[PDB]
Amino acid sequence: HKSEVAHRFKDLGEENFKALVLIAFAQYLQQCPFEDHVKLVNEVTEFAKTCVADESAENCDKSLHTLFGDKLCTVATLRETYGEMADCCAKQEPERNECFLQHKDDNPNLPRLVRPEVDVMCTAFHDNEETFLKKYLYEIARRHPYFYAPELLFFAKRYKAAFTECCQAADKAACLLPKLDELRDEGKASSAKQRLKCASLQKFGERAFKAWAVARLSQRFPKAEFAEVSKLVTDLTKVHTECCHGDLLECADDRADLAKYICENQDSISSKLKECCEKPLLEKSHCIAEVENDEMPADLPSLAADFVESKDVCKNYAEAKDVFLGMFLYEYARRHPDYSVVLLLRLAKTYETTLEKCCAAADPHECYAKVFDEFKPLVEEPQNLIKQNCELFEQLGEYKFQNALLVRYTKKVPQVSTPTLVEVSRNLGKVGSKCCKHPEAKRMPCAEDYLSVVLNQLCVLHEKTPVSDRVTKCCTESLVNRRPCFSALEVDETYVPKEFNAETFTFHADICTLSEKEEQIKKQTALVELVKHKPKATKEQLKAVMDDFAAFVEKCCKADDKETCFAEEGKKLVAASQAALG
Ligand SMILES: COc1ccc2c(c1)c(CC(=O)O)c(C)n2C(=O)c1ccc(Cl)cc1
Ligand SMILES: CCCC1C(=O)N2C(N(C)C)=Nc3ccc(C)cc3N2C1=O
Ligand SMILES: CCCCCCCCCCCCCC(=O)O
Ligand SMILES: CCCCCCCCCCCCCC(=O)O
Ligand SMILES: CCCCCCCCCCCCCC(=O)O
Ligand SMILES: CCCCCCCCCCCCCC(=O)O
């Protein structure tokens, strides 16, 4: 109302207010030490309390942007540490805020964060829960300047819960570790999806963004009217535009307004939004963004009715193309929660290409009469890959499934560096152990969101260190043709085998003491190298070599004088295997 800081403070609550202020500062002043931020927070919090006590106290009338910028310009070493950014302090609002946004470095040069020993973490956690948690909230935020603050807050709390539970455990490590690994992975995926989405908005434009959103929103909210979904797509697009620009405040408010709109009109949107709408102001957006799909209306007609058999098809389409196509998408998506979003777009594109040709023909109705037959092969392709790949993962385990993929992709793109192939294959492998668990009706949507991040990360690296035109093609292809393009890659006939290197296939006893994740990544690295040396080797030949090796290890690790063994048999294996592969 009269004082914005006061209002925010009352809504958020002291604890959340302080966490968010800390994050907001760490994202702009990525170089200042922890103690410096803690002091700014205390000062802002104290200031906020004065305003809560008296909305009319000095400066309490100033906007959050102005107050925020004034404090930022207080930093004494602003110029010495941030050089150019200091000049922003000479500008007036709103140029000042815009100037700050431009200097936020999406990827600073900070040391990697090393995970301490379980006991040290747990002890630090017990001795000062507050500074332990705020210390890492700081380290994470400064490293991910665009990570939406509230979401980061949500991760912190999941972190607190892991220590609280695990540090009291009998086997602290057995409890805590797997929790941290899951948190990290989920944290990495959330950050990558945010980056991906904003980058895509820049490349493909608003149209492609609206299409993706209509489809997505129709699956989750199948009972909502097309106009409401359109309303929602419109606002959602503004929201992502604002949020991508980087202004935390603008973004936060846009999201809040949308979640309230949605909660007020919930009975006309979805019946699954009950819980989400009762939760705290700070948790609404997040919750609704993850809400499960509502049940689709039981009495829904046939699409062929309004889109294939109708006589006004071309007349309606011409009158407002995107609207008509949007309607098609809406109708198709809410009937297919089991389809991935990208598949729905492929169907809409197909239907669009068809109407463009057909509506410019003598007898339209006859020209587009069998379009739904066009859809079949589009739908079946992804489905079959899912079946085939999940069956194979059922037989082999996560580890051996990862090796099968390793062989498969190394043969397809032999130019990619070995470490890159190992990482991508391992991740593809996890997508398999995470999605094949769901029933068929939920597999495709699952593979899509996970595969989208893996595929983009793969493309980012390669972009830096280009190595294959084919990968580059798939990487710069339409957002809808991406995964299909990679699926289409065929074995590389060109590739001339990498010459033999003794060292590369010589192993020592140190392999026996390595941890599981360590041994695997080591055997898997030799495997890629094996394939790059003998790309014409069949599955059979390769399978027999991996068996000798398998034995080789188990044998030498369970026998006196390891060193000699791995050096004596190393000769035999490498010699024998080389002969079996010619
Ligand atoms: C409901 O609104 C959207 C809009 C775009 C989305 C998503 C959700 C999700 C998440 C979800 O599937 O719900 C992902 C992964 N999007 C993209 O990758 C993407 C695609 C095209 C463009 Cl132009 C920009 C971004
Ligand atoms: C993944 C679910 C699709 C999806 C969804 O339901 N969303 C939603 N609402 C409330 C409809 N509001 C948003 C607010 C912020 C973000 C970052 C994303 C969404 N938005 C989506 O992207
Ligand atoms: C979001 C930060 C919450 C603070 C919880 C402390 C636990 C984080 C320690 C893990 C940092 C090492 C990075 C890693 O997991 O590899
Ligand atoms: C300088 C004090 C301002 C602190 C900035 C944080 C205020 C934003 C409120 C967040 C509201 C959550 C909205 C949502 O995403 O659901
Ligand atoms: C308000 C409705 C907006 C949606 C318009 C429907 C367009 C769907 C056609 C498929 C577009 C795929 C995007 C692309 O490849 O550029
Ligand atoms: C040309 C020398 C070939 C000998 C080296 C063989 C290395 C293959 C690695 C075996 C990986 C299989 C993994 C496993 O045993 O589970």
What is the set of domains in the chain, with CATH numbers? 1-105 (1.10.246.10), 106-195 (1.10.246.10), 203-294 (1.10.246.10), 295-380 (1.10.246.10), 381-492 (1.10.246.10), 493-567 (1.10.246.10)
- The whole-angstrom separation of Cα 146 and Cα 141 is 8
- The whole-angstrom separation of Cα 150 and Cα 161 is 17
Distance of CA 92 to the CA centre of its chain: 37
User: Cβ of 372: how many Cβ atoms within 10 Å?
Assistant: 16
Cα 228 to ligand 2 centroid, rounded to whole Å: 15
- The whole-angstrom separation of Cα 6 and Cα 67 is 12
- The whole-angstrom separation of Cα 217 and Cα 230 is 9
Distance of CA 159 to the CA centre of its chain: 19
- The whole-angstrom separation of Cα 451 and Cα 448 is 5
Contacts of 242 (CB under 8 A, 6+ apart): 250, 251, 254
- The whole-angstrom separation of Cα 423 and Cα 432 is 14
- The whole-angstrom separation of Cα 142 and Cα 32 is 9
Task: For 45-76, give the secondary structure using H, E and C.
Answer: HHHHHHHHHCCCCCCCCCCHHHHHHHHHCCCC
Q: Is the CB of 224 under 6 A from ligand 6?
A: no
Residue with CA closest to ligand 1 atom 14: 197
The answer to whether residues 453 and 192 touch, using CB atoms and an 8 Å cutoff, is: yes
The answer to whether residues 368 and 385 touch, using CB atoms and an 8 Å cutoff, is: no
User: Could you tell me which of 494, 519, 413 has the C-alpha nearest to residue 458?
Assistant: 413
Say what the alpha-carbon torsion angle 63, 69, 74, 78 is, to the nearest 10 degrees.
180
Q: Is the CB of 192 under 6 A from ligand 1?
A: no
Q: Which long-range contacts (C-beta less than 8 Å, at least 24 apart) are formed by 119-125?
A: 119/172, 121/163, 121/167, 121/176, 122/163, 122/166, 122/167, 122/172, 122/176, 125/163, 125/167
Cα atoms in the 13 Å half-sphere on the side-chain side of 161: 8
Contacts of 568 (CB under 8 A, 6+ apart): none
Q: Is the CB of 113 under 6 A from ligand 3?
A: yes
What is the per-residue burial (b if ≥16 Cβ within 10 Å, else e) of 258-289?
A: bbeebbeebeebbebbeebeeeeebbbbbbbe
Q: Is the CB of 325 under 6 A from ligand 5?
A: yes
The answer to whether residues 5 and 48 touch, using CB atoms and an 8 Å cutoff, is: yes
Cα atoms in the 13 Å half-sphere on the side-chain side of 323: 10
Q: Which two tokens stand for residue 104?
A: 């936020």
Q: Is the CB of 156 under 6 A from ligand 3?
A: yes
- The whole-angstrom separation of Cα 455 and Cα 461 is 10
Question: Could you say which DSSP state residue 309 is in?
Answer: I
Report DSSP letters for 459-492, one per residue.
Answer: HHHHHHS---HHHHHHHTS-TTTHHHHHHT----
User: Could you tell me which of 288, 276, 284 has the C-alpha nearest to residue 216?
Assistant: 288
Experimental method: X-ray
Say what the alpha-carbon torsion angle 129, 133, 135, 138 is, to the nearest 10 degrees.
-160
- The whole-angstrom separation of Cα 303 and Cα 92 is 56
Question: Could you say which DSSP state residue 87 is in?
Answer: G
The answer to whether residues 196 and 453 touch, using CB atoms and an 8 Å cutoff, is: yes
User: Cβ of 180: how many Cβ atoms within 10 Å?
Assistant: 16
- The whole-angstrom separation of Cα 44 and Cα 52 is 12
Question: Could you say which DSSP state residue 406 is in?
Answer: H
Question: Could you say which DSSP state residue 306 is in?
Answer: I
* 246 φ/ψ sector (left φ>0, alpha ψ -120 to 50, else beta): left
User: Could you tell me which of 392, 394, 397 has the C-alpha nearest to residue 408?
Assistant: 392
Distance of CA 323 to the CA centre of its chain: 30
Residue with CA closest to ligand 1 atom 4: 213
Burial of residue 141 (CB within 10 Å: 0-12, 13-18, 19+) is: buried
The single-letter code of the amino acid at 211 is: A
Report DSSP letters for 486-517, one per residue.
Answer: HHT----SS---PPP-HHHH---THHHHS-HH
Question: Could you say which DSSP state residue 396 is in?
Answer: S
Contacts of 38 (CB under 8 A, 6+ apart): 22, 134
- The whole-angstrom separation of Cα 146 and Cα 26 is 11
The answer to whether residues 30 and 42 touch, using CB atoms and an 8 Å cutoff, is: no
- The whole-angstrom separation of Cα 173 and Cα 176 is 5
- The whole-angstrom separation of Cα 137 and Cα 189 is 17
The answer to whether residues 345 and 215 touch, using CB atoms and an 8 Å cutoff, is: yes
Ligand found nearest the CA of 407: 6
Q: Which two tokens stand for residue 429?
A: 């492998």
Contacts of 558 (CB under 8 A, 6+ apart): none
The answer to whether residues 569 and 558 touch, using CB atoms and an 8 Å cutoff, is: no
Q: Is the CB of 385 under 6 A from ligand 6?
A: no
Q: Which two tokens stand for residue 156?
A: 């912190």
The answer to whether residues 214 and 344 touch, using CB atoms and an 8 Å cutoff, is: no
What residue has token string 């390769």?
542
- The whole-angstrom separation of Cα 195 and Cα 189 is 10
Residue with CA closest to ligand 3 atom 11: 115
Report DSSP letters for 226-270, one per residue.
Answer: HHHHHHHHHHHHHHHHHHHHT-HHHHHHHHHHHHHHHHHTGGGT-
Question: Could you say which DSSP state residue 293 is in?
Answer: P
Helix 129-143 to helix 14-28 angle (10° resolution) is 40
What residue has token string 């100037």?
99
Cα 207 to ligand 5 centroid, rounded to whole Å: 6
The answer to whether residues 5 and 60 touch, using CB atoms and an 8 Å cutoff, is: yes
- What resolution does the deposited structure have, in angstroms? 2.4
What residue has token string 């020209």?
367
